[PDB]
């Protein structure tokens, strides 16, 4: 909204815990911020190394999930079912950026 | 979008410096965010002491505005009839936020 960002992305893999990919093979760096009532999720376009994918055994625990999924009205739908609500998506200090807001199921 | 944050204040005039107050006597405090291309205002809601309103001489070459107006279309009119988009609107860390991003004149 008053941007110039364009689409974001399809989807999205986890690679390790906090490391996404999309359908264009690009690294995305996810990190939590909790608030008292909900859970954000601010996910940074960044080129960082990979190394082994890690096992889903490890991955059960995490807040974040394995995948995101583009899903109609700007939100993300993962692979729990839930819906993300897409707060902003822009540009901040040259990088994209995302910032998830996890929803209620409904 | 996703939140209960309410609405946004109706109108901000500074007071000093990167501190305003709106329609409620409450202060915010403003802080800039420089982009490339353009400019983002970051104001948060927070209380804080307030002496002496600065003079308008001392206000001229700031970057922020003298006051802000809510303006339809989520965005508000300053002093110089410039518009700034209201990209997001939301508590952080119980806190309550308002990121504007100044429009190019049209």
Do not use: C
């Not at 909204?1 to 390790?16: I, M, N, R, T």
């Not at 815990?17 to 954000?40: H, K, M, P």
């Not at 889903?56 to 999924?69: A, E, N, R, V, Y």
């Not at 993962?78 to 910032?99: K, T």
């Amino acid at each position: 909204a008053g941007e110039d960002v364009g689409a974001p992305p399809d989807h999205l893999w986890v690679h390790q815990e906090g490391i996404y990919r999309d359908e264009y093979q690009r690294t995305w760096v996810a990190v939590v911020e909790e608030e008292t009532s909900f859970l954000r999720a601010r996910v940074q376009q960044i080129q960082v190394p990979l190394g082994d994918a890690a096992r889903p055994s490890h991955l059960l625990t995490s807040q974040l999930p394995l995948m995101w999924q583009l899903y109609p009205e700007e939100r993300y739908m993962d692979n729990n079912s839930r819906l993300w609500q897409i707060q902003h998506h822009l540009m901040v200090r040259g990088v994209q950026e995302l910032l998830l807001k996890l929803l209620p199921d409904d």
